[PDB]
Amino acid sequence: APTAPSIDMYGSNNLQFSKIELAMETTSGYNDMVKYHELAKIKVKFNQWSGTSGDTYNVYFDGVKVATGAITGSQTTASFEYGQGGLYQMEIEACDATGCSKSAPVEITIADTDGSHLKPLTMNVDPNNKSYNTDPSIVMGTYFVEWGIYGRDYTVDNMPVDNLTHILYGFIPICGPNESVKSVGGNSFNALQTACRGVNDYEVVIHDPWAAYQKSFPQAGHEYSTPIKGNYAMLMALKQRNPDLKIIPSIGGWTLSDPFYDFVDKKNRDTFVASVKKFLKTWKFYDGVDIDWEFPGGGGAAADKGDPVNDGPAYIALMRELRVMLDELEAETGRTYELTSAIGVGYDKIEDVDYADAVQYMDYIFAMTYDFYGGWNNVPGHQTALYCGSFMRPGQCDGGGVDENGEPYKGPAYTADNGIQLLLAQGVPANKLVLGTAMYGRGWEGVTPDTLTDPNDPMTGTATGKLKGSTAQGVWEDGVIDYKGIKSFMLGANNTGINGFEYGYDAQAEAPWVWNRSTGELITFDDHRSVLAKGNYAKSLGLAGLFSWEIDADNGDILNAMHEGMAGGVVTPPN
Numbered sequence: 136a137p138t139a140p141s142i143d144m145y146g147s148n149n150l151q152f153s154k155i156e157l158a159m160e161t162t163s164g165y166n167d168m169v170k171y172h173e174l175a176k177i178k179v180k181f182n183q184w185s186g187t188s189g190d191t192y193n194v195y196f197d198g199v200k201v202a203t204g205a206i207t208g209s210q211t212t213a214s215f216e217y218g219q220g221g222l223y224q225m226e227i228e229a230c231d232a233t234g235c236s237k238s239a240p241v242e243i244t245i246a247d248t249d250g251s252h253l254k255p256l257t258m259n260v261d262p263n264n265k266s267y268n269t270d271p272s273i274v275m276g277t278y279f280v281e282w283g284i285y286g287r288d289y290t291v292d293n294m295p296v297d298n299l300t301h302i303l304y305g306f307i308p309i310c311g312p313n314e315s316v317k318s319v320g321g322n323s324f325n326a327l328q329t330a331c332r333g334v335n336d337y338e339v340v341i342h343d344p345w346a347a348y349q350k351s352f353p354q355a356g357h358e359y360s361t362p363i364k365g366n367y368a369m370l371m372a373l374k375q376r377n378p379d380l381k382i383i384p385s386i387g388g389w390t391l392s393d394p395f396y397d398f399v400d401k402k403n404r405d406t407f408v409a410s411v412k413k414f415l416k417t418w419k420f421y422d423g424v425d426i427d428w429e430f431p432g433g434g435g436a437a438a439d440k441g442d443p444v445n446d447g448p449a450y451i452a453l454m455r456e457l458r459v460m461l462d463e464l465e466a467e468t469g470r471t472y473e474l475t476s477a478i479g480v481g482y483d484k485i486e487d488v489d490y491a492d493a494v495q496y497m498d499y500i501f502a503m504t505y506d507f508y509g510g511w512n513n514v515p516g517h518q519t520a521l522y523c524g525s526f527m528r529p530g531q532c533d534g535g536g537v538d539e540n541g542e543p544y545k546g547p548a549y550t551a552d553n554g555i556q557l558l559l560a561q562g563v564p565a566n567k568l569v570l571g572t573a574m575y576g577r578g579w580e581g582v583t584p585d586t587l588t589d590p591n592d593p594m595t596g597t598a599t600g601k602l603k604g605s606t607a608q609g610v611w612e613d614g615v616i617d618y619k620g621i622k623s624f625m626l627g628a629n630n631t632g633i634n635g636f637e638y639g640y641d642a643q644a645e646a647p648w649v650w651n652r653s654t655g656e657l658i659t660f661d662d663h664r665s666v667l668a669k670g671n672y673a674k675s676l677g678l679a680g681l682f683s684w685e686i687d688a689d690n691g692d693i694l695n696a697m698h699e700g701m702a703g704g705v706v707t708p709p710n
């Protein structure tokens with residue numbers, strides 16, 4: 136028989152092959168950094184120095200023949216293409232009329248972006264996240280933010296994945312007009328300019344390729360030479376651990392919505408929709424797309440954008456067009472892909488979209504039932520309440536009243552139930568609506584007792600400015616604090632108040648607060664009680680479930696309460 140091939144490990148890239156080429160140690164345009172191949176090119180060098188070399192080689196993976204070719208003398212390169220990622224035991228055989236001889240087996244890795252070559256992720260979850268048996272029909276969602284791996288030190292293996300059905304990855308930008316990004320300062324705008332170099336306007340890109348696929352995480356077993364690293368390789372490994380998890384890219388958000396206002400022109404929708412199809416073929420761990428346009432009709436970060444007449448019909452066409460495209464991917468892959476969107480729930484945001492038309496294309500609407508009041512002005516209120524608080528004036532709740540100047544309210548007050556009932560009354564099915572819960576507070580300073588019109592209720596006071604604090608306290612920007620910061624610096628373990636704060640609860644609104652009467656610091660947030668009230672409300676109305684912004688800011692208490700409030704319930708999944 137021929138001499139047995141001897142595989143040259145170093146001549147064959149130590150047997151690590153990848154369907155995706157990702158630039159490392161540089162930051163450039165997205166199309167220069169990312170290249171995806173439907174088939175990996177596998178080149179393996181072998182030699183047969185003594186004896187006869189034979190005529191033909193065969194390559195086997197786990198005992199099954201996957202390639203064949205000609206022997207070229209004493210040194211041959213087996214060259215072939217292969218579609219399915221994975222880890223395989225490879226043998227190379229050489230054959231002639233006298234028989235065949237085979238190399239020892241050796242492990243070959245074929246990387247792909249579904250994580251098929253990866254072991255299940257090793258988790259490091261805070262043990263305060265508890266175990267539940269929530270019915271699998273109920274949505275339990277959260278947002279994981281790409282920049283959370285910096286100062287916030289919160290990585291994919293920290294997520295309590297057994298307690299989640301959906302992870303929304305915040306946020307994928309659209310190339311084009313993006314002046315709103317300059318509002319976060321730092322390098323965010325400039326990093327987008329880099330990512331969009333050589334990219335057509337209105338196509339998606341990865342904003343931070345260091346966080347997404349270059350950074351080596353030692354807890355994931357990454358090495359500097361591993362072909363896919365970053366949060367994306369950890370999400371691939373997380374999907375190997377929890378295969379029924381849905382991981383969905385969230386496009387837009389508050390700072391990254393400016394390009395959506397040009398989707399009134401179909402040509403820019405077509406560009407965008409094609410880029411999303413390419414994105415989901417490239418990054419196969421993702422299960423759909425979430426569109427967080429804030430907001431049709433305006434009222435978001437860009438003060439000079441928003442068209443109440445035309446943005447709603449653009450949003451609806453976008454959804455129609457994205458569902459056509461996802462149906463093509465389902466035909467191609469045999470997989471199911473979801474289309475979702477996070478939406479404003481003030482009456483003046485809902486009135487700009489005919490959701491009865493849009494929602495026929497969509498699996499879920501993540502209703503943003505939070506940010507109703509906040510440090511952008513000096514008016515206290517409940518930022519994430521179900522119902523109207525004691526602080527509101529007569530006729531403020533339903534908008535029939537007048538304000539303190541005698542001016543008509545323009546619509547119903549900002550509460551979760553006022554927005555859910557506006558959506559239901561126009562025919563959006565309850566089982567497509569997912570109710571938002573806040574894992575953060577918004578707050579003020581200067582709300583001292585002398586400013587209250589009702590002494591029992593600090594939401595009747597007036598602020599002098601935003602809450603101020605440090606990042607160790609969970610205050611990453613003025614006026615906003617992580618829930619785990621409120622728990623460590625204002626509630627304490629018994630939930631009865633520390634550091635001069637007192638806890639209170641508006642039982643009408645279903646909304647908690649902490650208030651330091653000395654500093655006038657007042658913070659509106661969600662807590663165990665108010666999250667249990669949201670789960671009861673969701674069960675009462677047959678909503679799809681609950682989601683939360685943002686998972687790094689919880690200590691486990693808010694996701695635990697999301698599950699606790701849903702116990703016993705089931706829902707009909709949308710078809």
Ligand SMILES: CC(=O)[C@]1(O)Cc2c(O)c3c(c(O)c2[C@@H](O[C@H]2C[C@H](N)[C@H](O)[C@H](C)O2)C1)C(=O)c1ccccc1C3=O
Pocket residue numbers: 389390434435436437438481506507508511549
């Ligand atoms: C209740 C409501 O309708 C709001 O639009 C909600 C809101 C908000 O959700 C966020 C922000 C807001 O400023 C506001 C407020 O808009 C501001 C700017 C508007 N153009 C308008 O002038 C309004 C009165 O206040 C009011 C943010 O600033 C913000 C910043 C960073 C991330 C998310 C956020 C973030 O999510």
